[model samples]
Structures are given as structure tokens and as C-alpha cells.
Target chain A: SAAARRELDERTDREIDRARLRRADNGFFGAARNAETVSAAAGYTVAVWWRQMTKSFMFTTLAGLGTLARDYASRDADRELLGAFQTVYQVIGDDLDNAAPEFSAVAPTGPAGIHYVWWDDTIVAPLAAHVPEPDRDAAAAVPEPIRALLANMDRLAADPLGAAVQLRVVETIALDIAVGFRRMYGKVLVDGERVFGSNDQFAWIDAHIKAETVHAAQVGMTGLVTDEAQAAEFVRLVEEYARHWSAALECFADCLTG
Target chain B: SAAARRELDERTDREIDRARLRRADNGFFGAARNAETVSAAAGYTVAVWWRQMTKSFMFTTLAGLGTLARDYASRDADRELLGAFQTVYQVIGDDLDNAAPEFSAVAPTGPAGIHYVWWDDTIVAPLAAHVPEPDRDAAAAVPEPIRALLANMDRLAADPLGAAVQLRVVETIALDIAVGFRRMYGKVLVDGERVFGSNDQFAWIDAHIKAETVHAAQVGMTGLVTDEAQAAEFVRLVEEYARHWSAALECFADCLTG
Candidate 1:
């Protein structure tokens, strides 16, 4: 009987040893994994897409403002202010519609629900949609690249490096979005009420928008480059793409508003 | 009336601004913080206590083995085995007294109510006591630390670094208790069944003791550790210091059992 127990123990030990060896051979047991390679062409594609989405949102909001301004062309300043508020509100609603489900899934209740919906529609989804798929998958499918990019972003956020290529890209897009908001809704108020005109609302919307935008940029930029230089290069390409497409977006806004 | 409305609007704007600034200053607001933190700490502490208790049971079972070997030394091998088993069953009442209450607090309905009293006395009461203070506080406090810890832990559970730490602590304690059990009880079971020529009762007793010890280790290592680590750590430190005193817990367990 004692012999039987010993035999069982020995057998179990052997099986465990075999499993461990197999895992080790496959690099499943904490070995350094080989880094995956990403294609430059793929990176460009993603950059193009990200730019496209940014341009789209810019135009969409511009169109909203233009429509509001034109709709109240004959009205007094009070009506025009109300109309602009209505336009921004409608745009916000559209943004909410596009984002609510994903927002709810990520964080079930409270401010996350509200904030996520706003951010996703305004920043994340729009930018994410523009990221070219091939490059997007290539970067996202790899681990090391994503980590490096995120780390760099964190560094930039903590202590901005002043016109350093990476910092420029991050700020340029954010500033542009802020500019878009300003263009869409000037500091006009309805019936002498400064709801959106107040610095409080302005600061709240600005910071939240920037935060969500930063998150989006991190997700979009990851995996598309290797070194800091490569990432900066990619950012340059994105900026170029934004510059070229901004005119088209403005045109689209004009048409949509008309 | 208009002035009042303006003041109200201005106040609301200020509040929103303050909230935004707060959000910007901090990263990740606490959510479901109190309930979650207490629950988590409760779980961790429970696991630790469970481990200690299980190890204690193993010590009990092993000591039983020595008793069986000494008492039935001249008996037949099968008779010695049975004697060991009977000893296990006889001593198990005390082991249950040490471990059952934890089981009730963790999983109340499944076992230990009708067939075991020691479970109610030892395992359940302490676990209930440890959980109530933290859990009640968690429920009552809106911005509780435990709740925040729980939410963060939940997030960390999904994240690699955090998950690794959690698993490490849990696994280390678990392995420590298991090895301790084997070192203390395994030898006794082998000696009692093989050397003393005990009877079938001893065999049954051995099985019960081993099974209960393992279960106790599970609760102690996993449940109590999660629930009582903070509390127990302090108590253990206090006990260690008090060991210099003649009236400390150093002799309490020995005096009760010996």
C-alpha cells in the first residue's frame, strides 16, 4: 500500500516535470519574447487615418457652428446665442449617441458613463476611425512598441519638452480641437446667461476634451513606431496629413452648413 | 429675479470649474470605493487566517500520528493503521473548532452547521468579527479607503503588474501553508498508519484530519489572508513581542492542547 502511494507520487512528479520542460521550451515560462517588427508603410496608413478622423470632427463641429450662425442670420444677438447653444447641444447629442454603448461597457455607471460617452464621440472614436487598419493592427498586435509609445506619452504629459517633435504633435492636435470649439461657439450667451460663456464651463470642457484626446492619441500612436525618432517622424507625417486635409474639412463644413 | 438667476448661474459655473480643476489635478476618481476596498481587504485577511489555521490543523494531525505510534506500538500493522485513523477523528473536533467559523463566514450554507460545533465557535466567529468592522465601514463611508483600494485592486487584477503582485502574495502564502502542512501532518499520517498497527478507525481519522487540514489551509491561506492580513500581522507582531512575558500566547495554545 505504501509502495502504491509512492508510485502515484512519482508519476505525478514526472508529469509535472514534463509539463514544465515543455513550457520552458516554448518560452511560456517567463522567457524574453522576440520583439515583433512593424512596417513603415503600415505606420503611414494609420497616421493618414488618424488625420482623416481629426479633420472629420473639425469639419463636423464647424458645420454645426456655421449652421447655427446662418440659421439665426436675421435674428438678434440673443437669438443667435440661443441658436449657437442649440447647435453645440445637438452636436453633443450626436456625439453621445455614437459613444454611449462603448462608454457603458467600459465603465458601467456615474461620471464614467457620462464622461466616456462624451470623450469617445468627440475624441476617441473619431481619431480611432481614422487610423489605417493595417498599421493599426500591426502596432496594436505587438506589445513592446505599444509600451514604449505609452511611456513616452506619459513622459511628455508629466513634463512637456517644449517643441520637441513628440510634444508638438500631442499639443498641435489638442490645440486644434480647442480652436475648433472656439470657432463653433464664441463667448456669446443667451438672455444674459453665461452658462457656456463662463470660464468654469469653458475650462471643464477644455480639460476633459484634452484628456480624452490624449488617451486617443496614445492608443492611436502606439505600435506605429519603434524609437522616439521614429515616433516623431510618424507624428510629423500625421501633422502633414492634417495640414493638407484641413482645407477639405473647411470646405465640407461650408457645404454642410449651407 | 434676473440678478438672482445670474448669481445662481455664476455659482454653478464656479462649482463646475472647481470640479474640473479637481479632476485635472487627480488621476482616476474613486468609484464604489468603500464597499470594494473593505471587501478586498476582508478577502485577503481571511485568506491569511485560513492558512495559519490550516497549518495549525496539520500540526494537530501530525501530533495525533505520534500519539497513535506510541499507544499502539505492539499492535498489528492494520490495527495500527486503524488506530491512527481513530485518533485523527477524535482529535478532529478541536481542529473543526479552530477552522469551522471561517468556513461559515466565507461560505455559510454549504457545510458545518449541523454536524460540527467547533466550526461555529472557532472559524466562523472570528471571520464574522473581522469582516463586520471593515465591511460595515466600507458600506457606511462614502469616500472610504477600502472602497478605493477595492476598485484599484479590481483594475490591478486585470493589469499585469498588479495581478502579478496579487498572485505572488496569494501563491506564496498558499505554498507556505501547504509545505507547512506536509511537513507537520504528512509525516505523522505515514508513521501512524504504517508503524503502530492501528485499526480502520485510525485510517478514517487520518483521512478526515488530512482533508480538514487542507480545507483549513485553503481558508487560512486564501480567505483569511485576504480578510485579515492587516489585523493578523499586527496581532502576530504583538504576540512575538509578548512572547518574552511568561503569560503570553506562547504557552496558551500548548497549555490548552498539551
Candidate 2:
């Protein structure tokens, strides 16, 4: 048992280190260069469009499902699991609310209006397939990464403890992107007035960074994954999700460039 | 407007500094010295009793109300407020669940049986009075700090935005106590077997410490208390709550000694 545990720990450490590298490579700065090109070519609309789409994905898909999962969880038996869901829900909710007004100020019609066609084609339609007797049009519209993320939520809901290891992986990458955006942009302006300042407006993301660090530590304490197989499974999930995330970002870049 | 903002910022800074000093003086470590004396004199029962009471308060009262507040919050309007509540809920929930089994291993009856009388006498009954047409015994039994905390929650529910500034003040002090306990007692043991370890068991508290630091920053961005009067009110609430917390700790010590 001790030997197995030692092996598992080694694998977990290696996988976690790999995940960190992937995170660094795909983080906001990595995405920012592409974003800058889009902004330069198509104007700030592209950047704003990306923000809206990502924010919506965060709020509707991630935070929304997390809230539902918490509701479905057994309070006593799933206290830690429920707390994990609640943490994401709270963090994402703040991000959505904090950005909505500012984003709206920049694009009066809002992201849903300005990017409605893109969202329907790329996100909403694909996500619809996850429902019972789903519409073919919607299912066809969903991107590969978006579909994977949605399915991952289902996995998390069905096997919270087993899936818990992947929670930190998901949260850390997301936070890195958030912090990166704030660092690069510093501030967003519309009509000669500052709408999003890194010092004040980005507090939600800063808070999220702090919260996720804790979440990652809490996940380590769960001690659910006890063997090499389980540790490898976690690594598989992280790599799979990271690929999906990278694909989703490329999709956004294409939507903007086109 | 700039003058008013500057005044508010100054007042907030001064109040926060004072609260920090208060926290340092009366925090868990400060109380831990007293706790050690009680434990040394009367045995581990005293220490275990304190943990149970504190854990129950965290889980039932603080985390419970926080969850309720998040539920009651309006997503679009109360984003920061809801996030604040959610933050405390997740952090405290983790602490309670992580410690519960281990605490049980130490005392089969658990803290509930040993401290039930003291809790009912000093907490529950008094809290009941705050409810509309409350039960007499419940009202009579509630402790002062808890009473203040419950009443504070009532205010927050009514005026989430205006009350947002106080959220960090409450969370930070509470976190200070949790961190203090971990620092003072590196591990919890029962019958020659390790039950709680700082390495694993105290992760929840360590996480809370991280979350609360970011929360304090987020509160500053809310810009709720924008004048000297409002800032002073926030400070008053912080001081009042701190006093209540100190009183509650004294009550715990007295219960052990008596």
C-alpha cells in the first residue's frame, strides 16, 4: 500500500507540474498576442466580443452548472463537494456582475446582442445537444471544446469525489487567464471615460486567484486518488480539458478574424 | 467629490488598521494561550470542547447564514455581496467537515453532547429572540457576539450594497481565529494516534486565510462607504463585533473553568 501511494504521489506531482506548464503556455498572455492582432485588425470589438463570449461561458456554463450541482449534492455526505461547487458559483457570479455593466457600457447592445449570431452558432446550439432529445442544429453548432467542457460537468456531477482532482486543474487555468487579461490591459475605456480599471474593476478576478489557490490546497487534502491509475486519470482529464480550452480560444480568434 | 472620496479612504484605512490590531490582540493565538491553560488543568476535554463549540458556530451559524444570504442575494445587483457570503460558506464548510470526523475520533460523544448545555444557554435561545415573535427560551439563551452577528446578517440582507464594506471585517477576524488555532495546536491526537495534522487537517484554515486576504481587497473596490459618517459606522460595527467575539471567547473559557 505504501509503495502504491508513493508511486501515486510521484505521478500526481509530475502531472501537476505538466498541467502548470500547459497553463503557462495557454494563459492570458499567450492568448493576448492573438487578441492584440484581432484588435489591431478588426478593432476593439474583437476583444470585447471575446470577453463577452468567455464571460457568458463562465457565467452560464460553469457557474450555472456548479450551482445546480451544489443543489443536487447531499449536504452531510457531500459537504466538501458542495463547498467546491459553491466556491466556483460565488467567484464566477462576481466576475459576471462586475464585468457586465462595464462591458455593457462599451457595447450598448451588450455581448448577447453584438455577438448573438456567433454565440448561437458556436456555443448555444452545441450545448443544446446535451439536453434530452436535443435539436440537431444546436448540437451541430457546438464547438469540440465547449462540448467537452459540458460533458466534463456531467462527469463532475456524477462522480464528484473522483472528479474533484480535476477541479484544481480547471480553476487554476481559468484564474491564470483572468489575471493575465487584467495585467495586459490595465484599463478599458469607452467614450473617454474609464470603464474597467485594473486597480478596482479587476478585484473580482484577483479575489478568484486567491480563492482558487485555497481550492487547490483543499483538493489535495481530499485524498480521494490513492493510486497510480487514479493519479493518471486526473492527468488525463487535465490534459484533455486544457486542449479543449485551447481549442475554444482558437475558435474565438477565428470568429473575430473572419 | 474627490475630497469626499479622499476623506472616506482615509477613514477606512484608519479603521481597518485599528481592526487589525484588535484582531492581533484577541485572535485565536491570543485565546489559544488561555485554551492551553484550561487544557493543561482539566485535560484535553477543555480543548476539545472549545473546538466543538467554535466549529459548530462556524458551520451552523456563520456558514448557514452565509448560504442563506447567497440564496437571497440578487445576482445582478448583489454580486459582490453574494460572493462574500459564498466565500465564507465554502471556507467554513471545509473546516467543519474536515475536522468533524477527527474530532469524533477523539471524543465519541463529540462536542455536541459535552457543550450542548453551554451552547443552548449562551447561544441558541438568545438568537431566537431576534426572529419575529421569537421563542422566549431561545431568545434568553443566545450569546452577545452571536446575537450581534445574526443581527448584522439581517442588516446585510436588507442593505447588501451598503453593508458590503463590513463583510471583510467579519470574515478576517473569524479567519484569524481559525488560523490561530492551527498555529497553536499543530496537530490533534486521540489515544496515541494522530487525528488532525497541520499538514493535512489545517489546510481548510490555511485556505480561509488566503480567501479572506483577497476578500479584504475586493471590499475596498465595492466603494460602498463613501463618506466619513459611513466609514465611521463601518468601524463601529467592526469594533462592536470584535468586542462580542472577545466576550464569546471569555464565555468559553469560563465554561471550562467553572
DockQ of all candidates, in order? 0.01, 0.03
Write down the TM-score for model 2. Answer: 0.36
Where does candidate 1 chain A have its weakest 10-residue lDDT segment?
A: A29-38
Q: Assess each prediction's global lDDT (C-alpha) against the native.
A: 0.31, 0.42
lDDT, candidate 2, residue B187? 33
Model 2 ranges with Cα > 4 A deviation: A1-258, B1-24, B35-142, B171-175, B187-198, B206-222, B226-233, B252-258
lDDT of 1 by residue, A157-240 (tens): 222121132322433344443444433333223344322344543432465354546545663112212245544554443343
> Candidate 2, residues A135-167: lDDT per residue as tens digits?
233223556655565455445433423234444
Docking class of 1: incorrect
User: Each prediction's TM-score against the native?
Assistant: 0.20, 0.36
Error of 2 at B129 (Å): 34
Q: Given candidate 2, what's the lDDT at residue A31?
A: 48
Report the poorest 10 consecutive residues by lDDT, candidate 2 chain A.
A107-116
C-alpha DockQ for predicted model 1 = 0.01
